[PDB]
Write a protein that binds this DNA or RNA. Structure first.
Lengths: 98, 50, 50
RNA sequence: CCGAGAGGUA
DNA sequence: GGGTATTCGCCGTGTACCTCTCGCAGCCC
DNA sequence: GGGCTGGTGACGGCGAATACCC
């Protein structure tokens, strides 16, 4: 089961961060540890945050923070960073669907 | 006396403590600690006496 | 102040107020469209630091 | 016509 | 469960004046 | 055409914040 997490990038290089993240996944071939990468867009929230379907090992955490132009995760702590919520993922997918 | 103040006991714990004094408050991993301590003093890239 | 070159090297205060108003407008928009609470915590941290 | 940085006089 | 000791951050360091240069890139929306 | 976005050579005083030790 892969839960969601929030990544902070340099705001403005966000599509390039998403592309480099997919490429680092297919380089270090932890393909079973990443599901998607979301940057939602309206005819652009959220202004500088990248959503990642992921699991939490320290190897995958070092992988996402070794992706260039990425500051770090946003959570309660930096040891065990925080997933967001079930209904919050569902509402973001709702407005992305709508 | 220096070894009596030491809490560490092997190579791994020493590399963890050095990785923790460099970048504060984050999960260390043995690969990350090896990479940091080889890139502090022992790499042609980041360290160069003339 | 103009520097007589077509550009305005601004004073530091307008830069600071511009940063606070950028971050505050983005926080109003994120409280508007029901952002997940981790992101508005981060946004309020950014506003406090600005 | 404001701030930096450098130099100089007493 | 306080009485001394060691650390940790802040606060501060002369007055007038003259001349010169140089002041935010990136970039694909 | 243009928007907006994020070092490692100072030293003394002094008081507040731990510390350790009984």
């Amino acid at each position: 089961k892969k839960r969601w997490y929030v990544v902070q990038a340099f705001s403005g290089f966000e599509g390039r961060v998403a592309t480099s993240l997919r490429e680092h996944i297919k380089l270090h071939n932890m393909e079973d540890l990443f599901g998607e990468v979301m940057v939602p867009t309206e005819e652009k929230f959220f202004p500088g945050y990248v959503l990642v379907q992921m699991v939490m090992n320290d190897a995958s955490w070092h992988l996402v923070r070794s992706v260039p132009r990425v500051m770090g995760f946003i959570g309660g702590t930096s040891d065990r960073p925080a997933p967001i919520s079930d209904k919050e993922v569902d509402a973001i997918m709702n407005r992305l669907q709508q | 006396e220096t070894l009596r103040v030491d809490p560490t006991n092997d190579r791994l714990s020493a590399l963890v403590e050095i990785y923790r004094m460099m970048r504060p408050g984050e999960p260390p991993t043995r690969e990350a600690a090896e990479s940091l301590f080889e890139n502090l003093f022992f790499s042609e890239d980041r360290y160069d006496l003339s | 102040v103009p520097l007589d070159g077509g550009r305005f090297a601004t004073s530091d205060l307008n830069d600071l107020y511009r940063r606070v108003i950028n971050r505050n407008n983005r926080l109003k928009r994120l409280l508007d469209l029901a952002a997940p609470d981790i992101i508005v915590r981060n946004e309020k941290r950014m506003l406090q630091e600005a």
